[PDB]
Design a protein around this ligand. Structure first.
Ligand SMILES: NC(=O)c1cccc2nc(-c3ccc(C(=O)NCCc4nc5ccccc5[nH]4)cc3)[nH]c12
Ligand SMILES: [Zn+2]
Ligand SMILES: [Zn+2]
Lengths: 475, 227
DNA sequence: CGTCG
DNA sequence: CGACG
């Protein structure tokens, strides 16, 4: 683990480790009822060499300078650990070796913080793709980054963020109903104690606002999928040959083949992207860099039951490139049954888009990341049970296989093509006439992971129409 | 809502508080005013104390001492009428409010006449036992001990909360529950007519009760006129 | 433990 | 929060 700098001994001493455990407690305390956002860092530090020990305490509010610290050199490690454990007790109410931690009122709460020559012979575009999707550098930029506001105390562990996400599921189901204000107050208390937030001297807010709740949930899902793709990023310890290119290429169990750019299917994909790129609500042009026909292991056979099901279509699915690795390793997944269902526009299930713009908006490619990823999928939308206004659902209607959120903007229905007997809606944005609706662009949704079959993966370039492109566009 | 109420007033719980102006210690059991300020040492407010005169020497424009000061309605009626003055220094409804305020004055003087003999004859452990014997909750501090004893003897032995079952206590505006619904939150249930039973004095405190001359004049907690 | 900073 | 009677 680390060493708090307010002691100043990071260069002169390190934190202690015995019996597997480590002596660095990060207790929090959040009370929205009064507005208390207190912290407490407690460390037992041993000199790098000599047998000299200190107990370091630091307290105050989150993010602000309000607080203090104190270092107390101890006599020996024995007395030092005695004082450390009795301090942990006095503060959090539980003992150091308390397997099951039981929260007590007016007491703090500990927080888990995570720490710690050959040649490939493959086609080159795939190796570039791999270097992108297994980009350990960006993975570290995601997890191991400062951003004090996000992590005012430290990089929380996976279990912490997952528990926070579950409590947010509870918050969502309370927002949907007319829950008691006290229940939501307790939800806020626990969610802010579990995840610290620099609110300055401002009283921490309540989670009454549903939109901010969904935003924090997006943040938590981001961090969660990040740590998951990081756990997938690791795991190799054999086959030390053919560069890690082959290693992480075979870690996906997928057959990836760079579709010839000049090929017919590639031309049809380019026309799809061109027509369905609605610059409206999208301040960025798109350039088709690379095409990849992907055959995912197993997904090919599990899709056969619906191979004959009529009304199959090629659709866009787009998420952060960070997840794409896992999305290729395990195939497109559905939200878990225990995740909240009110946040989803049309409930849990594979989402799709006939407008590449909408699906691309989810890649969250920033100005500093002009490259994005998106997937073309042969989904066998059996029968589209259409829904104009948003509506969370559970029961698939009788003889209906999929949901279609209707937006006024749709691909030109006349402009469509049957590739492999699959309808491709590569038309330009026309006014569907659908009125009294909530969606802008159409949403296509299925509710069976086998109903989908990922066919192509597009490397896209998000040429944001900025000063650079602006100079290139007037000469 | 408490709303902090930085202006604060009460009797000196100890003789250790130093006046932030003259630096002299504030004697125990002496009327003293403070202002609640956010300390830089920890995430928690703290009272800067002053002598009653030193507080008004530093200049304050308190227009409504009752509402802007936490604990104003918990003092002696005489010290109250002193603060009410020092702060700035109808046809029938008029007499109605005047007479009800006279009743408030009587009630305040009565409670203090109680507490006087209460601590004069009884020890702290005796008050603790009195509170225990009425399903109450022993508070921290002799002052709060005698406050809850007087409350239970005048308005009846308080009964557990309806939600969390924690004992509630009288606040400036109404009775607030001090219980903890869960380990993460505190109960904010607030009402002006809580459920109570009658106070009970054991045989031990029978001759002592006679020494107190317990009148047992039943009544109801008068709450502030504000709104 | 109960104040005060 | 810690510090002290
Ligand atoms: N990429 C496409 O192909 C695509 C195309 C068109 C529409 C699309 N909608 C999605 C989508 C949105 C949202 C989610 C999603 O995690 N919900 C989260 C809702 C939510 N609130 C919460 C609040 C608290 C706790 C947990 C919460 N989850 C998944 C897919 N993807 C779309
Ligand atoms: Zn003074
Ligand atoms: Zn209660």
């Amino acid at each position: 683990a680390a060493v708090d700098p307010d002691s100043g001994l990071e260069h002169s001493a390190h934190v202690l480790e015995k019996g597997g455990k480590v002596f660095s407690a990060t207790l929090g305390l959040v009370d929205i009822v009064k507005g208390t956002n207190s912290y407490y860092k407690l460390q037992l530090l041993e000199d790098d060499k000599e047998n000299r020990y200190w107990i370091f305490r630091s307290w105050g509010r989150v993010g602000t300078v309000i607080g203090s610290n104190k270092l107390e050199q101890m006599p020996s490690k024995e007395d030092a650990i005695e004082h450390f454990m009795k301090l942990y007790e006095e503060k959090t109410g539980n003992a150091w070796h308390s397997k099951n931690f039981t929260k007590y009122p007016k007491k703090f709460y500990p927080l888990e913080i995570d720490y710690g020559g050959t040649k490939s012979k493959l086609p080159k575009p795939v190796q570039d793709l791999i270097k992108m999707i297994f980009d350990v550098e960006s993975m570290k930029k995601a997890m191991y980054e400062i951003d004090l506001q996000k992590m005012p105390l430290g990089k929380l562990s996976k279990r912490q963020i997952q528990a926070a996400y579950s409590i947010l599921s509870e918050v969502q189901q309370a927002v949907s109903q007319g829950s008691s204000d006290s229940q939501i107050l307790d939800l806020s208390n626990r969610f802010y104690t579990l995840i610290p937030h620099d609110f300055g001297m401002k009283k921490p807010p309540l989670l009454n606002n549903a939109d901010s709740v969904q935003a924090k949930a997006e943040m938590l899902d981001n961090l969660l999928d990040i740590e998951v793709a990081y756990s997938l990023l690791r795991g190799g310890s054999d086959d030390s040959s053919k560069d890690p290119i082959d290693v992480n290429y075979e870690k996906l169990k997928t057959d990836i083949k760079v579709v010839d750019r000049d090929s017919e299917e590639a031309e049809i994909i380019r026309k799809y992207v061109k027509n369905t790129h609605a610059t409206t609500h999208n301040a960025y042009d798109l350039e088709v860099i690379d095409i990849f026909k992907i055959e995912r292991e197993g997904e090919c056979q599990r899709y056969k039951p619906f191979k004959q099901l009529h009304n199959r279509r090629l659709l866009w699915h787009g998420s952060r490139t960070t997840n794409f690795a896992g999305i290729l390793s395990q195939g497109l997944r559905i939200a878990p049954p225990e995740a909240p269902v009110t946040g989803y526009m049309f409930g849990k299930g594979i989402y799709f888009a006939d407008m590449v713009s909408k699906s691309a908006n989810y890649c969250h490619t920033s100005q500093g990341d002009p490259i994005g990823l998106i997937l073309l999928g042969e989904v066998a939308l059996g029968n589209m049970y259409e829904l104009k206004h948003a509506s969370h659902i559970s029961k698939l209607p009788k003889g209906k296989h999929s949901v279609k959120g209707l937006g006024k903007t749709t691909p030109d229905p006349s402009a469509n093509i049957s590739l492999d007997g699959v309808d491709v809606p590569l038309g330009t944005g026309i006014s569907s006439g659908v009125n009294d609706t909530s969606l802008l662009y159409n949403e296509y949704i299925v509710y069976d992971i086998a109903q989908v079959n990922l066919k192509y993966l597009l490397k896209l370039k998000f040429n944001f129409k900025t000063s650079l492109w602006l100079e290139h566009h007037h000469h | 809502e408490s709303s902090d109420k930085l202006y604060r007033v009460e009797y000196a719980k100890s003789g250790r508080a130093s006046c932030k102006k003259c630096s002299e210690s504030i004697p125990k059991d002496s009327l003293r005013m403070a202002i609640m300020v956010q300390s830089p040492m920890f995430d928690g407010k703290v009272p800067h104390w002053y002598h009653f005169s030193c507080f008004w020497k530093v200049g304050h424009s308190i227009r409504h001492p009752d509402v802007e000061v936490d604990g104003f309605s918990e003092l002696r009626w005489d010290d109250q009428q002193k603060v009410k003055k020092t702060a700035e220094a109808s046809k029938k409804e008029k007499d109605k409010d005047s007479k009800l305020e006279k009743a408030l004055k009587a009630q305040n003087d009565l409670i203090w006449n109680i507490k006087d003999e209460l601590k004069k004859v009884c020890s702290t452990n005796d008050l603790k036992e009195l509170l225990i014997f009425n399903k109450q909750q022993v508070p921290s501090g002799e002052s709060a001990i005698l406050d809850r004893v007087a409350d239970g003897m005048v308005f009846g032995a308080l009964l557990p909360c309806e939600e969390c079952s924690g004992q509630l206590v009288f606040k400036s505006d109404a009775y607030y529950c001090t219980g903890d619904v869960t380990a993460w939150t505190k109960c904010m249930v607030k009402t002006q007519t809580p459920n109570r039973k009658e106070w009970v004095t054991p045989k031990e405190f029978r001759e002592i009760s006679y020494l107190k001359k317990l009148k047992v004049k039943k009544q109801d907690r008068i709450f502030p006129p504000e709104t």
